[model samples]
Target: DFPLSKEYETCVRPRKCQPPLKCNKAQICVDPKKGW
Candidate 1:
């Protein structure tokens, strides 16, 4: 299961717009493994 809340401040938020294929609710630059 994914963490309901970010573990750190660096964790990307879904609202934070990023470049294409850059960030998602699952995978974020802070933790790519969590993404698809």
Candidate 2:
């Protein structure tokens, strides 16, 4: 769990989609295949 948390913070948390790629507040963006 510790290693998983570290990996998530380092690799996933920092890897955020740009503003244009993100769904706006109160709206949902869903990819049928990927689900973002």
Candidate 3:
């Protein structure tokens, strides 16, 4: 994975969880940390 562009760094790239993963808490989205 690569770093986010400075223009978009402040903005978040939302990720969606699927299959067995589902969502961990309160149906919140899952993050890859580095990326999806």
Candidate 4:
């Protein structure tokens, strides 16, 4: 299961786990429970 198909790009595909952006902070792509 995941968030919107298009949203992945807005956070995941755009920056990934790179610290510079920290896109996985608090958003659809982060999934705080799972920890991407």
What's the lDDT of the predicted structure labeled candidate 4?
0.40
Clashing pairs in 2: none
Ranking by lDDT: 4, 1, 3, 2
**Model 3 CA deviation exceeding 4 Å by range:** 1-22, 33-36
- Candidate 4 local lDDT, 1-36, one digit each (tens): 334332323454443443322344454444434445
Residue 30 in model 3: lDDT: 36
The 10-residue segment of model 1 with minimum total lDDT is 1-10
Instruction: Mark the 10 consecutive residues where model 3 has the least summed lDDT.
Output: 2-11
Clashing pairs in 3: none
User: What TM-score, to 2 decimals, does candidate 3 have?
Assistant: 0.19
lDDT top scorer: 4
| Candidate 4: stretches off by over 4 Å | 1-11, 19-36
List model 2 lDDT by residue over 1-36, tens digit each: 222221112223334432323333433333334434
Report the C-alpha lDDT of model 3 over 1-35, residue by residue, as the tens digit: 43323211232334333222323455443345433
lDDT of each: 0.39, 0.32, 0.34, 0.40
In candidate 1, residue 36 scores what lDDT?
36
Clashing pairs in 1: 27-35
